[PDB]
Design a protein around this ligand. Sequence first.
Ligand SMILES: [Cl-]
Ligand code: NA
Ligand code: NA
Ligand code: NA
Lengths: 186, 206
Amino acid sequence: MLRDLFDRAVVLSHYIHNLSSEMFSEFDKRYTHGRGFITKAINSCHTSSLATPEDKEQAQQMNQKDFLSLIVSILRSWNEPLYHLVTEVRGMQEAPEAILSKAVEIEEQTKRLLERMELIVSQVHPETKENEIYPVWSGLPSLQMADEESRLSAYYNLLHCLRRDSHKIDNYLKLLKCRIIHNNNC
Amino acid sequence: MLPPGKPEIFKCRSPNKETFTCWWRPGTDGGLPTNYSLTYHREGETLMHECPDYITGGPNSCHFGKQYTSMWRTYIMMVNATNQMGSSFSDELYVDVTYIVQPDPPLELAVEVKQPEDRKPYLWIKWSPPTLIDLKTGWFTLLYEIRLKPEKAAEWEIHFAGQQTEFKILSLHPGQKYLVQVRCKPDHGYWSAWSPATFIQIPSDF
Ligand SMILES: [Cl-]
Ligand code: NA
Ligand code: NA
Ligand code: NA
């Protein structure tokens, strides 16, 4: 029942982007409002090396099976940094509570979204490659730095990147739902 | 005799995630500029570019058409003000089209009273999305809100219409005249301006 899965997938993705957006705002207001953190955020995302559509035309040129596999690779790639963001923040003595809350919820919801996406791929492309190739995040030592400016910068970049990739994933799932269920007549 | 003061790129907006425009203001307490040059580069490239279109967005603006606009990618931009005596550069602005989305107002707002049988009568509101928004592919998702009030009421009543382009309102005061407006926002982004008001007399028989 594609229609129900797609609807639940889109609810989760839209929700995850909203939380990531709010997390990053609070983090920024609270910890980095006044410095050149934005300038250090340039080109720092682990999913950057993936070939992702960057405008509507590129999106339309991408066929559905590759598109679904792309969403799954991005989501699978965020499981590691979300796990460490929660583990690191939770193990602070004075962990920011609104921030930790959001991270925990994004971590759990991201697993749920990836479960729906696996169901969607099974339903729509039953005999795909069971191929896992996704980009590795390896930024844990930077989050663990003792030097505070370097630490806050590594966090800034992580939340900036999450804010971007959640938005992208949400937007690609909305395109595919319209494409697959409604033949682009949403 | 003075070179220009420091200009400022004070706003960028995208009406539909396909193009965007940015606006700058000259500095005060410098000389008059005889030219402006807006240049930028994009994250993950070294190439410098100049504003592709100084005309479409009107005065002191840079418009980026489709072949120049993409999502999920930071633009790092600067405007320089120059005249015969010298020049002045703005601060660099970091802009991502993903976060400056603000649609134009919805179109064709129309309102009607409808009185069916053994069923509450209603006010029926309809509208259309702004033009050049690509909803049917799911590239763009639009949400709407209606407000209405009679004249002199201190508060507006607001109704969230989600993604619908029509809405039914039940509890209107018989014989009262209402001003009705509609606005829209992306799923993620800023609300449009409210559309122009349409007016509706609710009949005595209600
Ligand atoms: Cl707003
Ligand atoms: Na524009
Ligand atoms: Na201009
Ligand atoms: Na484009």
